[PDB]
Write a protein that binds this ligand. Structure first.
Ligand code: HEM
Ligand code: HEM
Ligand SMILES: [Cl-]
Ligand SMILES: [Cl-]
Ligand code: NA
Ligand code: NA
Lengths: 713, 713
């Protein structure tokens, strides 16, 4: 059946905004996963998981009699899709169970792992999500094998359909670089937002870059991908060597024996894939990656053998039974156990990417320090496994259960506890009046609160106005934030704050984080008053101010908006059309198409554009909260044409006189072109819609102001 | 960006079920269009429309100073996409304004018509839907030009995204038949459910079949397509000649002058398309279809000149200025007015398809009767225009406003008024107990109520249990309905009915339509009781019983289920996989994926399968309402393989012993295969899910029982 995507493959796609509807979710509208989890008997679940480790099923027998390696890999792949550029991927939504991730080549036979966990999932039902269960199982595998974890938080709610993530443009699994849809250009520069070297891989190619078995060049890829997953050199080394202390790879025969991945398999496969024609197709005969490497002399127990082997032998290039490049220890005895036959032993083996930990000079220093000080290695690995598996969970307030680590970690973007009375409704009214008496304008107030709140992204639940990080490096210097204007607003709000707090007794005080947001609310109220209308903008106090030392400047850099169509901002010239980037921003803000539409139209007329641009400011009463944007956008009296100077700017002229009435960007005019967006704009541009527009604007403004408010969830 | 559809293009698509979410709808959750419409000043709207017909805009000047022909075409196209096979298309959702219909070649320049209506749309806002306004404008156009319409109903609520309709498989607009995706096979057999001869056409090619200008062969296509749009020969002739009493076609120059359709046009086009490089590109120079025909001497006034010309001249094959085949009156005077130059006149002209009305022998007899009796022609046209424009509106209960026709028409599947008090809650309890005491089984009761209610389709709002048409021809003899079993059930319910009604005082009585539904309710309660669970199934009385004489048997044929995966039923062998057909049926029933899932799993274990088939009956307590279907489908101890006899039937065997446990179809096992459906099944198959399964089942059962209950809206 031919579809709209076939006819118009470059038309803007809005379905990414209308994912995660109550239509596809089986749980009732009222279901609250945190509440269900909080009642789970987590200790019972962990007992069941421990039992499972050595309960081998014949349809996928356990290596060494212990599923722990398989499960650590499962948990590591669940978390390992995470990209810092957009916060997408990661373990927090359980997306490993859906397309495409359930069928990525690097996820081969993790279908079997997941199926092993169905009886437990079934037994505890809604009180433990698959998303949580996958991480918990990895933890229990570690514990079962003698490694003490740093802790565990529940609270990842399950999702019910695939997310729309850009995973690259290649049309071939595992395609090497430089093809027609290459994710690399220049001197091996990976395109943002990607964090893997090939389509369908988690990070890097275990044989080496584009298959070339060079550990030194492989290190470069490892460093770059892992940095794009928020991991530094120490964390990277700890995770790779820690992981590879356990289990084995699977490459017992040629890859051509492996059949269809799960999404391609027959209905009778019942959701599994990669069925293999090689010998028994499983166990001793398994084929997953094609590599045949067992790293340590005790693959089912924590040890210090990984670095003992890495440094204690010289390594020779060889091939697995499937023809894959890997490494064998020169002159070594057969000291590695076989996974199934007690009478067979094997020489130590390594991947190319394992040898990178020794042959890259900066990794070599860390690895040697871990070899000499295994307690340092064990602590680094524990910490990095916690980070790996919680990096997309958001503020600590979302962390559930009895194993949450008390230690506050910098990567959590921590927010201090509030320890004083909060402002009440009378105080909020007093502060809004002081703010409006100061001389700050509607445009300034709205722009500043928007700058502060709109850093939030739902993908990894980072950002937002909590913390008052807008006052700190690097937010305060971001171009989109208008650093000089912002400094002036903040100075005035800081003096309001200081004066209010100085007059209180008790310990009541207002945070600057709250005051920024409240001031934005005063600006939206005043804008409604400018339009002749009473309005009340909801405000919830309780944000705190984080310090500079609680704000990792390098980590915060991925939150910088380089495109923000809500402020008609584009930092540079991109390949992707600006309206595409607006929908991507809308998705990160968790907005539906209607919310995106009302929000942008209001921001326009309130003066939120960067640089005071008149692009899309379709009103003759700027700083008044009206539906002017939509009424004027849809007026057929105006004709639109791209300028000579710039094809991404448009001039709107009176159709009869030729006179210039407005200018706009693609972000502006898409509302008058896209057939679904223009249907939305029509509702808000109708003569019966001024009250609707204000009500809907205030609701979405409030939504944005509270996106990070998990302390009120 | 590569998507799941690219990787796995034949995987089943569930997004058709989660269209029309509250996420994409800008109106609040509580908005009720009927309430808004009921207070519209419809007369004021029609006054503004009447004024509009002769107020020309320079950006698309009005032919002859009158937009009436443009707007009649607009409304005929709005309604003209309707197919009886599935009820899809039609005017009732305003889908002309979205992709793909907004960009079909046959809809060329209707973008301009719709734009001309924005000021009115804007003025009246949410109180008149685009869907209604498109039809109302066609009516007003007819009225303004001297034609008395049969009436008008409002109540088509607007939609906010495109429907997922199968419009054919061709990858080229207007592709002639016999291509690699040909919609024709055999001796010019058009594939179901399609109702047009080419991709992007409303019905037929105005030049003739695949462009061969033969009126006799074009008649064949006309008859077949119009029959697939529920029109008979008399209605077809009336419509075509009626329409072509007005306006003109547009073909002033070559087609290559016409640019991109709206979905492909530049953002600056602001939702318009087909911009033409030919002279002024509009008005006297317009190009729409490429044909250049004006049918009558008064294109802005109702007349009987179309048949006068048709029969009063002989016709010669000629070419338009764009090279299209059309017909000109041999030896005629220049009596047809020009659309813009008062000093020019033209000879009469016709399309090939217009001459079909004279050269097809059956059309000729009708056309001649209409020529001799133009009052007959006007009445037939008025009735057929009403049918055309209301065919997908559903039961007369949905019809709103002051111009609804009082005459009840057979094609409306009419339901007699109820004229007696209804049963109350205590009566319903008494009846459920009588039904259960009769000996009728859970399987009988659930199967019969399902058979009666599940003919409903949301596409045109036909079908459902109201009417008790299950007792009548042709429903009572449909294979899916198990005619002999059904007759026995109905006899027993009819005796219960007679005994209850005989005992009442006052005029209280219960309809057989209500009793069939109530009995099904008693069967679901009893099945819950059989499982250890007391539940009350909601029931709403007020259905009435329609007669055989109020039931058009031929029209009812398109509602026969030839595939019903809810009953594990396939009447024959189809190209489309059965699971595809289940999701198509779920969409017709207005079901979400969770609803489809729960409902199927419960039906299985209640014994609703046709023929008492064991396929999918994964329980040892049939006729008890339990979640056994899901628990047993998801049990990894059972291995599934296609049978030798039939690849579409599967055996489930114990994995260890080989013992045969179950058999299933693709419809059953897709719940264990598809990654999204299996996630749903897992929720219902969990150990905490018994109460949820029962509650969700009862709610979806009740929803199906009430699909046609617009009397309670
Ligand atoms: C440069 C990074 C990495 C590369 C290229 C990589 C590569 C792979 C490959 C190819 C396999 C074999 C799959 C198979 O055939 O069954 C595997 C196994 C595994 N990896 Fe990694 N890996 C990396 C990092 C990680 C990390 C960070 C962890 C966890 C902290 C991890 C834990 C595991 C474990 C436990 C196994 C063994 C699976 C089993 O016993 O079934 N690896 N690795
Ligand atoms: C076999 C069926 C039909 C065919 C092949 C057909 C074909 C066409 C074509 C090719 C045009 C010219 C489009 C343009 O170039 O602007 C047109 C115009 C029009 N048709 Fe039809 N038509 C059919 C049926 C109908 C019916 C059922 C109605 C309404 C009852 C309708 C009403 C009109 C009107 C009013 C116009 C004039 C548009 C104007 O003045 O701008 N036609 N038709
Ligand atoms: Cl994601
Ligand atoms: Cl439709
Ligand atoms: Na994420
Ligand atoms: Na329809």
């Amino acid at each position: 059946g031919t579809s709209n995507r076939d006819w118009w493959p470059n038309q803007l796609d809005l379905s990414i905004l209308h994912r995660h509807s109550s239509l596809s979710d089986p749980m009732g509208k009222d279901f609250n996963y945190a509440q269900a989890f909080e009642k789970l008997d987590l200790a019972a679940v962990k007992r069941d998981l421990h039992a499972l480790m050595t309960t081998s099923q014949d349809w996928w027998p356990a290596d060494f009699g212990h599923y722990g390696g398989l499960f650590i890999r499962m948990a590591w792949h669940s978390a390992g899709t995470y990209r810092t550029a957009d916060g997408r991927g990661g373990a927090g939504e359980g997306q490993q169970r859906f397309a495409p991730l359930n069928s990525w080549p690097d996820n081969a036979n993790l279908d079997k792992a997941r199926r092993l966990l169905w009886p437990i999932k079934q037994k505890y039902g809604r009180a433990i999500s698959w998303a949580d269960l996958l991480i918990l199982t990895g933890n229990v595998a570690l514990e079962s094998m003698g490694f003490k974890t740093f802790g565990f938080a529940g609270g990842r709610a399950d999702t019910w359909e695939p997310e729309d993530v850009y995973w690259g443009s290649e049309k071939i699994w595992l395609e090497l670089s430089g093809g027609p849809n290459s994710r690399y250009s220049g001197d091996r520069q990976l395109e943002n937002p990607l964090a893997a070297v090939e389509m369908g891989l988690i990070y890097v190619d275990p044989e080496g870059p584009d298959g070339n078995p060079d550990p030194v060049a492989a290190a470069r890829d490892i460093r770059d991908t892992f940095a794009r997953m928020a991991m530094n050199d120490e964390e990277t080394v700890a995770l790779i060597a820690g992981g590879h202390t356990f289990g084995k790879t699977h490459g017992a025969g040629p890859a051509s024996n492996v059949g269809a991945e799960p999404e391609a398999a027959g209905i009778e496969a019942q959701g599994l894939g990669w069925k293999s024609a090689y010998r028994t197709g499983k166990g001793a005969d398994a084929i997953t990656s094609g590599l045949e490497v067992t790293w340590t002399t005790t693959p089912t127990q924590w040890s210090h053998n990984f670095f003992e082997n890495l440094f204690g032998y010289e390594w020779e290039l060889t091939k697995s039974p499937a023809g894959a490049h890997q490494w064998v220890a020169k002159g070594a005895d057969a000291v590695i156990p076989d996974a199934f036959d007690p009478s067979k032993k094997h020489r130590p083996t390594m991947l190319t990417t394992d040898l990178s930990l020794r042959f890259d000079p900066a990794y070599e220093k860390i690895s040697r320090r871990f070899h000499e000080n295994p307690e340092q290695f064990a602590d680094a690995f524990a910490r990095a496994w916690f980070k790996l598996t919680h990096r997309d969970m958001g503020p600590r307030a979302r962390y559930l259960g009895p194993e949450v680590p008390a230690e506050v970690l910098l990567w959590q973007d921590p927010i201090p506890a509030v320890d004083h009375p909060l402002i009440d409704a009378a105080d909020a009214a007093e502060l809004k009046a002081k703010v409006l008496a100061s001389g700050l304008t509607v445009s300034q107030l709205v722009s500043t609160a928007w700058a502060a709140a709109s850093t939030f992204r739902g993908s990894d639940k980072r950002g937002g106005a909590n913390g008052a990080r807008i006052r700190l490096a690097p937010q305060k210097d971001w171009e989109a934030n208008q650093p000089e204007q912002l400094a002036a607003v903040l100075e005035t709000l800081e003096a309001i704050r200081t004066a209010f707090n100085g007059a209180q007794r008790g310990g009541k005080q207002v945070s600057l984080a709250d005051l920024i947001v409240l001031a934005g609310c005063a600006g939206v109220e005043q804008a409604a008053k400018n339009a002749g209308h009473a309005v009340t903008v909801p405000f919830a106090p309780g944000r705190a101010d984080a310090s500079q030392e609680q704000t990792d400047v390098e980590s915060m850099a991925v939150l910088e908006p380089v495109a923000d169509g809500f402020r008609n901002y584009l930092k540079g010239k991109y390949r992707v059309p600006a309206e595409v980037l607006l929908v991507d921003k809308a998705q990160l803000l968790t907005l539906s198409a209607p919310e995106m539409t009302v929000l942008l139209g209001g921001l326009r007329v309130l003066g939120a554009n960067v640089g005071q641009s008149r692009h899309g400011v379709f009103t003759a009463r700027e700083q008044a909260l009206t539906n002017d944007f939509f009424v004027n956008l849809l007026d057929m009296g105006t004709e639109w044409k791209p300028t000579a100077a710039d094809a991404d700017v448009f001039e709107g002229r009176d159709r009869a006189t030729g006179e210039l009435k407005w200018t706009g960007t693609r972000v502006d005019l898409v509302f008058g072109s896209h057939s679904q967006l223009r249907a939305l704009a029509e509702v808000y541009g109708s003569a019966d819609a001024q009250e609707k527009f204000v009500r809907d604007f205030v609701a979405v403004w409030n939504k944005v102001m509270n996106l990070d408010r998990f302390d009120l969830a």
